[PDB]
Amino acid sequence: MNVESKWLEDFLVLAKVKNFSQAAELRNVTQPAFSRRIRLLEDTVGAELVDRKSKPIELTPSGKLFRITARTLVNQIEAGISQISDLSQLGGNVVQVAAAHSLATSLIPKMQQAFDEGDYKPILSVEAIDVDEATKELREGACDILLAFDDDILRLPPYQSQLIAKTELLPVSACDEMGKPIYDFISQGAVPWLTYSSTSYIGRQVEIIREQVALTPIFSSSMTDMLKILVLNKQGIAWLPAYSIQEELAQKKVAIIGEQSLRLPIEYYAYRYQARLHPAGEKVWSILCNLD
Template identity: 40%
Template sequence: MHNIETKWLEDFIALAQSQSFSRAAQLRHVTQPAFSRRIKVLEQAVGVQLVDRDAQPVRLTESGLQFLPVARKVLSQLQGGIKQLSQAGAYLPRINFCAAHALSFTLMPELVQWIRRQEPGFMARTEAANVDVGLSALRKGECDFLLAFHDPQSWVKLDANLFPSCQLGWTRLMPVCKATRHGKPIYQLGVDQDVPYLAYTAEAMLGQAVRERLRSQVGRLSLKKVYETAMAQGLKEMVLAGEGVAWLPELTIKHELESGQIVLCGTEQWVAPLSICLYRAASIEKPMVEKVWQLICQRYQ
């Protein structure tokens, strides 16, 4: 089954009601080309044509008429479920975490589980985001804690009085690639020419750490960028497919390293240490946030 975004369903319902791509796009606050693309993607996801574009005004096909009540029911049930959850959670104080993508599915679940065993009287919410987005949310008071990698050479320096931090551990940012059946790297940094490079986007914190590592070392590497994304998980999938070399946090590829699917493809000079830190805004005064902060500091310091 293809993933279907709720905004596509809302687009489809708006189009059914307005019978006009331009009017529906206005109602959905997007450009008409973008709106048309989203309707097309929805049709591809469900596998049938939902809209008769040749008709004036635009009308739904037979399949579209059958799908319309389904779309309305799905959105209604989803909205109702969210409302029930919100009401159920209203009796517990909520703590909002923001976490780097790579940490949101590795360390974050373990951390929340441990906190709840010590202090079950709260509801936790985690949002995965790039570190710059998380930092902005922390400064604006939109999240209570930010879990992020910290590279002393490249990351933004925060005022410790305004944004105290607690170091939760360490990992390494490693240049890795797919292994041959004999356990050898299919690419070798410093030896091969034009090694296909799977990179982070410019705004990604891990990308900044990699660039600093490359600049700080004397040796020159022959890299040819062939792909980029902000997410380590996306680079990991490309590495597993044998598409090139990427610098990945060791904690995100532990299983693949142990199984021999992925191997280090360069010397230790290209490995960058990364600390894992939890940040909070000192200006936020919430009793539960303070209690959780004290629990974490006692455990890790």
């Protein structure tokens, strides 16, 4: 059998207005066309859904029960289409990537420039990682690949992992026009500190050397680019990933201000759960595994 979706809207409008002419005007169709479409729906369902002898027009019991059916059907259509709107606009080659913000901004330009033309060319859809739900999001298929720091769960089965890179958090401070750091670690007093939350991977790395440094937290944020901006504004010092300050480190805007003992090793991976992605997803995974 078959059911036409516009008939559901027709029946809902008719049940609400209780008038064939008004419901036809609301549905942008002529009155006989609306009547005939209502009768087509009634034949398709197999019962009279509208009492013909009632003025104003009322619904039969079967129509009362089919109101709920039509409402749930329209709502399900609208939801299953809204959830596919963004994926359909990007095409069948869309690859959903959740990522840490800095990892995204650092790696995705190279991945995008590494794409070859063709019918299976990957179209990236990148979203900020949900630090609390990224694992379940990877398990349920809401994203294909996850660019994230070292994680004892994501790196092990049932998930697949590829070590993308291993860099270091550098304690850095702004500089004057002579290239000399504004804040040091040679003083009896502490230094204005732009910290992460300990609830984050980078914060867990920073808290290892927390005892041997004099710090005074004046700003907290897990957004490492926020801390980088506040470092550039001479507000304080911060442990920043090496891949995110290369421009400012080459120039004399920022300087490392610690012993080699304060450089904190970090490493970031690409994680996946599905043993088999669509061809675009597998090409993205291969490009990640081969990012030089």
